[PDB]
Structures are given as C-alpha cells and as structure tokens.
Amino acid sequence: GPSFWLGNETLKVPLALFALNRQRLCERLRKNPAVQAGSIVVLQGGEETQRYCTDTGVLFRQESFFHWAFGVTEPGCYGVIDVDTGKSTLFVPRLPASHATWMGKIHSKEHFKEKYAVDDVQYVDEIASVLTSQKPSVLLTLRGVNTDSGSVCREASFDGISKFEVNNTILHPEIVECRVFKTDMELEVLRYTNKISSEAHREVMKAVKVGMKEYELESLFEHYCYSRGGMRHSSYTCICGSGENSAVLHYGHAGAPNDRTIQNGDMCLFDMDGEYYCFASDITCSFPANGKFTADQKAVYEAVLRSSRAVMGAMKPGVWWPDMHRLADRIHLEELAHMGILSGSVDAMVQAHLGAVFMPHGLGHFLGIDVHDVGGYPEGVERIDEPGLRSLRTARHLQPGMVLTVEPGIYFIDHLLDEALADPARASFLNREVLQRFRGFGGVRIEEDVVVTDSGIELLTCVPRTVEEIEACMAGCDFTPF
Amino acid sequence: GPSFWLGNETLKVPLALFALNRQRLCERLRKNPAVQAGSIVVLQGGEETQRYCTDTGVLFRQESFFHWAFGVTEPGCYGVIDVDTGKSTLFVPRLPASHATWMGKIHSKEHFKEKYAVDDVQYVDEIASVLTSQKPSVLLTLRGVNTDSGSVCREASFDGISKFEVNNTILHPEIVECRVFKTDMELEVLRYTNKISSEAHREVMKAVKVGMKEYELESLFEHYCYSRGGMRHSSYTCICGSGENSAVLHYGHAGAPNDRTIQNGDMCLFDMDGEYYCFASDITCSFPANGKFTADQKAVYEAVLRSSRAVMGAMKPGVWWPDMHRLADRIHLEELAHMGILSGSVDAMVQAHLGAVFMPHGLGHFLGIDVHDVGGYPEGVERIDEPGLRSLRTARHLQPGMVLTVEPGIYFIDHLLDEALADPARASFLNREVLQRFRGFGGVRIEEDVVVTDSGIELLTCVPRTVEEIEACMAGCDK
Numbered sequence A: 001g002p003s004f005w006l007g008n009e010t011l012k013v014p015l016a017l018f019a020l021n022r023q024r025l026c027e028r029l030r031k032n033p034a035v036q037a038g039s040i041v042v043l044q045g046g047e048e049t050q051r052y053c054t055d056t057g058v059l060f061r062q063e064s065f066f067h068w069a070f071g072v073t074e075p076g077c078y079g080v081i082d083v084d085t086g087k088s089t090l091f092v093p094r095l096p097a098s099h100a101t102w103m104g105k106i107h108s109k110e111h112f113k114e115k116y117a118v119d120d121v122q123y124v125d126e127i128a129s130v131l132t133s134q135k136p137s138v139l140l141t142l143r144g145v146n147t148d149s150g151s152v153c154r155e156a157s158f159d160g161i162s163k164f165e166v167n168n169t170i171l172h173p174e175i176v177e178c179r180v181f182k183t184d185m186e187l188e189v190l191r192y193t194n195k196i197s198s199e200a201h202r203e204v205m206k207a208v209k210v211g212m213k214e215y216e217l218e219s220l221f222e223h224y225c226y227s228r229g230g231m232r233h234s235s236y237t238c239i240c241g242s243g244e245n246s247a248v249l250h251y252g253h254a255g256a257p258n259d260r261t262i263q264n265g266d267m268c269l270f271d272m273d274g275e276y277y278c279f280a281s282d283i284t285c286s287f288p289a290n291g292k293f294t295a296d297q298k299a300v301y302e303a304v305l306r307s308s309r310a311v312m313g314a315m316k317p318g319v320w321w322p323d324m325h326r327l328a329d330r331i332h333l334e335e336l337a338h339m340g341i342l343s344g345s346v347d348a349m350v351q352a353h354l355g356a357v358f359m360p361h362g363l364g365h366f367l368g369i370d371v372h373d374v375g376g377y378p379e380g381v382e383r384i385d386e387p388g389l390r391s392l393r394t395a396r397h398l399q400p401g402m403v404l405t406v407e408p409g410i411y412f413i414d415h416l417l418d419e420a421l422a423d424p425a426r427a428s429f430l431n432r433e434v435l436q437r438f439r440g441f442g443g444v445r446i447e448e449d450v451v452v453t454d455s456g457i458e459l460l461t462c463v464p465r466t467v468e469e470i471e472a473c474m475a476g477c478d479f480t481p482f
Numbered sequence B: 001g002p003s004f005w006l007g008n009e010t011l012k013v014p015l016a017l018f019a020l021n022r023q024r025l026c027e028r029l030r031k032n033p034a035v036q037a038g039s040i041v042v043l044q045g046g047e048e049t050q051r052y053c054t055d056t057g058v059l060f061r062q063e064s065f066f067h068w069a070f071g072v073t074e075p076g077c078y079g080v081i082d083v084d085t086g087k088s089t090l091f092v093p094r095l096p097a098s099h100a101t102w103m104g105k106i107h108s109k110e111h112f113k114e115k116y117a118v119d120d121v122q123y124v125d126e127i128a129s130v131l132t133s134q135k136p137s138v139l140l141t142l143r144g145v146n147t148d149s150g151s152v153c154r155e156a157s158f159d160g161i162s163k164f165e166v167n168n169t170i171l172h173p174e175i176v177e178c179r180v181f182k183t184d185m186e187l188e189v190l191r192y193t194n195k196i197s198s199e200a201h202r203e204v205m206k207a208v209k210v211g212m213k214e215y216e217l218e219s220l221f222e223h224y225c226y227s228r229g230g231m232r233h234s235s236y237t238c239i240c241g242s243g244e245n246s247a248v249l250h251y252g253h254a255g256a257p258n259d260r261t262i263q264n265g266d267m268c269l270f271d272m273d274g275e276y277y278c279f280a281s282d283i284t285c286s287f288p289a290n291g292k293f294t295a296d297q298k299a300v301y302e303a304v305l306r307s308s309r310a311v312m313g314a315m316k317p318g319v320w321w322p323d324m325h326r327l328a329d330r331i332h333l334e335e336l337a338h339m340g341i342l343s344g345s346v347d348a349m350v351q352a353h354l355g356a357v358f359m360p361h362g363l364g365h366f367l368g369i370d371v372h373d374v375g376g377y378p379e380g381v382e383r384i385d386e387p388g389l390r391s392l393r394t395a396r397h398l399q400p401g402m403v404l405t406v407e408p409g410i411y412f413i414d415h416l417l418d419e420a421l422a423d424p425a426r427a428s429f430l431n432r433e434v435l436q437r438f439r440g441f442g443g444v445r446i447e448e449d450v451v452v453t454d455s456g457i458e459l460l461t462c463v464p465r466t467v468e469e470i471e472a473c474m475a476g477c478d479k
C-alpha cells in the first residue's frame, strides 16, 4: 500500500495506519447501543490561515482528530466514514486553474484516492448531495471538551447540514478512547520520533558551550530534526532553560524567548521535541552547561533519576497513575532530606503536600498526535484537588497500548518555597540555611516516553541519563552545519 | 535608551524607533481635517493562540500595526496614543500567580514602562476606567481592507467601549501611509535582515548537493538565520523549488512541502527569508543544482539578471511602478527572442501581453513589517486589469523612503504556454522546436530588496548574482 515518506532515512508511514484507525472507530461505535444503523461519521479538516489581516500564510498543520482518521496533509478537506460498512470517503477542494501557477499541480480525485487509500473521493462542494444520496440515519459530528486546554472541539459543518439529523455527543468520547490506545503501526512512528529527537538531544549536549544563547541550541535541535528527521514542525515551542530559567516549566514562549546566555556553572534543562507527520515526541534532558556536575547538581539530578527509574520500574497494567506521582514525590522528599535541604518525618512531609513545592506539575501525560494527548479525564475519572496532583493530565489506571511521558523534576521556585516557609505546617521541614544555597539553582527534569505493555513498559527514549554518561557524551570530541 | 537585542552579533533595535513612529502618526493625524482635538488612537495587540482545540501553543508573533507603533512582543496587550500630546500608554495583561511557575517572572508595570519607553503602563482590565478618566473626544480605532489578502483589519474592542464615541475610518489609511515610508531607524533593521538572509543564502549555495531534498536547504537556511541572526520566525514559508518546481511561484506550502530530490542539471529557485523583531526581508536566489550553468541555464538566468539591473538602474522618485513591470516584460521578451524561443516583433509581443506568459506575477511589492507590506493600493490607485500587471501589489509612483522588492522572473509553465499556443494572437511568436527544450526547465527569479532614495535606490541585498559570482560562491570562494 501507499506510504508517507520524506525520503533519505525518514520513516515510511503506511496509510494503512489510518485505515486501521477508521476500522477501530467503527468497531467501537457499533458496540455503542445509542448508535443507530446507517450512521455516518463526518469530520472537517483544518483550513489554511494567515497572520491577522495580512496575506502572510501560516504553515498548515492538520487537525489532530482528522489526521488520526485520514492522515491528510492538504487543507480544506472533509472526511466521512460509514459506520456499518467502514467505507471511507474523502472530500477535497475543487481548485481553480490559477492554482497551477502559484501553488502546484492540480491533482485528480483519483490521485487522492490512490494517495490516501480511501474508498471514494469527491469534491467538497458536493458533500451535501453525496451524503444525501447515501440515505444516512444520523450524522455523527465531533464536539467535546479538551481537558488540557478547556477548548471545545470544532464540529464539522457544511452548507445544507441543516437538512440532516446530527448527533454531536456520541463521537467524541469514542474517538478519544481509540486515540488513547496506540496501534502497533502508530507505535512504530512514536519509536521513530523518539529516535530522531533522542539523536538531536545528544547533538545538543555535544554542542553546548558556555557563552552561547539558549536559542542557539533550539535552532540546532530543530535543524537536526528537520534536515535528518523530516520533522518540519516542532511538537511544541522548545523549552531551553539555562540557570534559573530551568525552574520555569514552559520557558521559551514569546514572553521569555530562550534569550539567556548560558553561563559557567548553569544547569541546562532542554525540553524540546518535534513531530513527524503529526506524531509527537516529548523528551527532556538536564545537564551541566560546562559538562561537569557539581556535588549539589549531582545530588539534585540523581534524585530525579531515582524517581524516574522507580516510576518506570513500577509501571504496569492496573497501576493508578496518581500513585506514581505520589511515589515520585516521596522519593524527591527522601533525597532532599538526605541532602540536608529537609529534615523530619517524610511521612509528615507527604501528608503536608511538601512534594508539590518542588514538583508543582504532573508526573506525566498521555502522548500521541498531540504532545498532551486526549483522553486523560474521560467521564467518571476525576481530577484530584491536591497540590501537584491537580496538575496531572490524567488520573487513569494504566492499560496496555497507552503511551505516557515520565517526567519527574525538582525545582527551586521562590514563590512556592516562600509560601511553604510561611506555612508552619511545612516551614519546620525546610532548612533555610541549606536551601539558601539552592536559590537560583533552577531545576532538573528527566522526561522519558514509554509504552505500557502487558507486563510493564517499553522505553522509547534513548538518551544519556547517568552522570557518567552525560559527562562522557558532552566530552565527546566528534553534525557540523556550515 | 533601551533596545531590543538577542545578543551575540544580533542587531540592537532602539525602542526610540517605535516612539518615532508614534510621533509621525500623531503629526499626520493632526493635519487630518476629520480629526478633532482630544482624540485617542486605540490599538489592540495580538493574543496567544493554540492548535485547534488542543493546548499546543502556537508561537506568538505580534500584529503588525501594533508592533509598528509599540514594538511589544508580549501577547494580550493594548496600546493607546493621545493625538494632541503624543502621550503613549501600554496596557499589559494582569497575570495570575501561577504564571511565575509555568511561564516566568511576573514583571511589574514599571518594568514594561522602562522596557518599551512608553509614558505610562496600566493593566488591560483597567482600560475603560483609564480612558474614561481622560475624557476623550473620540477613540480612533483600526479598520480597513488589506489589498493583498482582502481581510479586514481587526478593530480594537474592550468591555465598555460602547460608552465612548468610536471612529474606525480615519486611522487605517493614515497609519498605513506612515508604514509605507521607512524611517532611518527602520532601514537599519531592514539592512540587518537583508544582511543575515543574504549570508544564509550564501551558505545554502555553498552547501547544496545533488541528491539533497529541497527541505534540507530550508532547514539549513532557517538554522543560520535563527542561530546567527536571531530570526526565530521566518517572514514567510520558504519556497525551495528544484527542477520544474521552480515554475511554482509559492511552492513549499503544506500541499507541496519542499520534498523533491534535487537532480543533476536542475535549476534551483530558493525564495526564502526571515524576520528580525517583526521586520521582514524577501530575497530569491536562482542557481544550478550542480554548481555549473548550462548554456540554456545561462541564457534564461542572464535574461532575468538584465531585467533586474535595468529596473534597479531606472528606479527613482517619480517613476510609475507599472512602467518598471512593463520594462521587465520587454527585456524578457527581447532576451527570449535572442535565445530563439521567440521570433517576431517584440512590440507586437508586448501588445499581445506575451510577457505575462513568462512572468505571471507582479514585478515587486512594498516590504516592511509584512513581506507584502501595506499601502500598495490606497484610495484612488487602481489595479491594472491586464495579465501580469493585475498581479502587481502596488500601482503607485515611487517616492523616497519606500522599500520595494525587485523580483523579475522567467518561468516555463505548461498551461500558460499551451494557452498561448492555442491563441492566434500569441501562437506565431513561439518556436515550438526551441521551446520544447525548455519544457520542465522550471524558471529563474532574482529578487533584490531596495530602498527608494532621492537619487535612485539603495540596494539592501548582498548575494552573488552574475554567473561567475554564483559558480564561485557554490565552489566555496570567500566573498
């Protein structure tokens, strides 16, 4: 069958991947008692966009649900699936003659059918008449709430949809649940994205020199991922935190655009990834800017390495993800106590939520077509209203096929530390005189991507992780663009 | 005063640049008979966006009119200017404490006042109260039509604006006209963007190899502009057309994503640039993939080079830009005839609009904060309804301070050639027996950025252009 490919050593992704997803969605919908026979799934692709009122085009990236079902890269398309048969039909725009001058070849309907291995291809302006001729029960459209953004999914619509019976409640929870569980074909892509990004992280560690700007490493990472990986997009805005910036979880945005000079003695926290064909990776490496851990840096870093490996070692089907978050908290507190930053009963620290002072974010999240993938809080799965845990992007139990990030971290965040020092329930645990040394330290985060198996997990990421390994990697005398 | 800077060898941009723009706008509005005393210009900045319904953040780039006036990089801001006094007030979001954990330090209002050198800073939620305090005659908001996209500019709005008198017709043509004419400080930035982009084009020519994918060069170009120039964003989607893809003017979009393998004998057309601090550059270099021009490639290229230099040599204040487009058409037809592709009277070719077959786009466009900058077609300036000329992005007369691209090109586009061969008014001019050899050639585009001066132009771009210069640059020669 046909496959998506950018040549060179990039991965060939079979379009059968998306046919399997369409089939899995139909199989699940058929088992839903509320689903009438003759139902048709209707999805609307993304459209081209420009900057504000200008004609400056924004690079198009397909909507995730639509890509999951069809894998279509072209803007302005629709896609429908007959639930009972699973028959797929892709609607493409009818392009004007001038498209041949400015944009490129005007491909046939037959070309798209062969390209995407769908059952039929029609023009977008025909969608109402085509659907009418098919005598459908009900049009199943996408509407639901993304539990990370709070946004409502955009329901498909076309002129003449008035005429149909539309249900916009059934589909979202079912297609979400399908996306939660990755097929072996999806997993082959996620292995690939992790490979390229792992290689790019290694190159960054090799290249980093005191005096460079953080964004120089962002540029190198993205250049490796694009030129060698075909990853034209980044799965998110790259986070290149040097020094105290490594305590800023989502550093690198426009308000704080990776513009700090890397100084001798800094800890680097590089949380960056790209996507290949809308499939994500999410990896974070922490390392000393000058290639040699100090004693304090080693202690903080190896505390996070310990929680990382303890969580991965415990992960298997049936494990409650909040329990893993709480395991990482307890480990961090134990290590911080060993360092002398903390004193007293770790049990009491945990009862007082002291772990969230040092890790205010969730231990990890689902990963897939979106870096913060869907399905973390389906109906009946509630968010825990406790420090740290409330930032978890899922409170679910692990099952085979789920793809998770494991990204424990320890950070020295002034306003969270100051809050704790003012709370008598937590101040007694903290040793101000030792902690003062760690103000401005920043933080360490170690992020791995894993797949839940029948017996445990499969690690997708392959980067240096121990102190010895990182120091060996950064000292490696051996990718020189220009 | 304070300056924008990304360190290393990047350009320090003084915030005085934007203060001057604010000054120029007030001076122009004070002379507008429709403007009454006590008027306040109100602009709304861009906001953060995400991918569809996800929480995947989109890299924020400021709206261009707002940037021109204030140069603010943060999302969620408003900006207002008192016309009579020129007093500027920046409105910044009131951030939650959570921001200190996830996004970074919560800067004080005084921090932003210092950073942007504005007269006052307030929080966005206080805009209604602050403006009511000032007792304005009218609020001058932004609404108009962009003549390249056809979009309507987003007019500023806030809770309680209904209580004010709002005019949305006066500002747009005036702030557009200010943007048409670049101050000396703006030119310093456009000189820098051209510098970096030119260097990146040189590096690409040095690095191209047969067998590479087009997007490998896109990646290298962006990496140079960002790592060495601080051009985090690119000014538009890079166009890396190899072979017949060089006949596609806006190749490289999602539908045609620079994924062709570069083959021996191919002509490369690389139309790619970046922006620094929302200031654009627009450069195109054409060159043979294997580093050596064939005879045919030399002929097509030097035809475009001749038109390029003819236009640049003729550009000066008072010149009508469509005349420069027709000048390029005539030179193209002359040289295509000299190559044996065409035969007959060039006068007759021009009268038949044959030039548009080979250059179906406009000769060049205004450049500034947007690659296709504003002000090309103000009221009274009409689009010429003829092939080629109708694609011009401005029909204005050149004046000092204008910044334009000069990007003639020659392409071999089958459906346009076939249309001409079926047209008796044009068919006799084309020699099939020679044209057959150039089918699938692609095309050549040579794009320079220039500033109109009192004497002529200042050329901002600095890349190799002659056949000998290009072959030398791709052989790694220092220059």
Ligand code: PRO
Pocket (backbone or CB within 6 Å): A249, A250, A271, A361, A362, A365, A393, A407
């Ligand atoms: O947003 C999240 O959930 C993770 C935590 C650190 C940055 N990314």
Ligand code: PRO
Pocket (backbone or CB within 6 Å): B249, B250, B271, B361, B362, B365, B393, B407
């Ligand atoms: O859009 C325009 O006007 C020019 C023509 C070639 C590509 N850019």
Ligand SMILES: [Mn+2]
Pocket (backbone or CB within 6 Å): A282, A365, A405, A407, A447
């Ligand atoms: Mn993550």
Ligand SMILES: [Mn+2]
Pocket (backbone or CB within 6 Å): B282, B365, B405, B407, B447
């Ligand atoms: Mn241009």
Ligand code: NA
Pocket (backbone or CB within 6 Å): A271, A282, A283, A284, A407, A447
């Ligand atoms: Na992360």
Ligand code: NA
Pocket (backbone or CB within 6 Å): B271, B282, B283, B284, B407, B447
């Ligand atoms: Na151009």
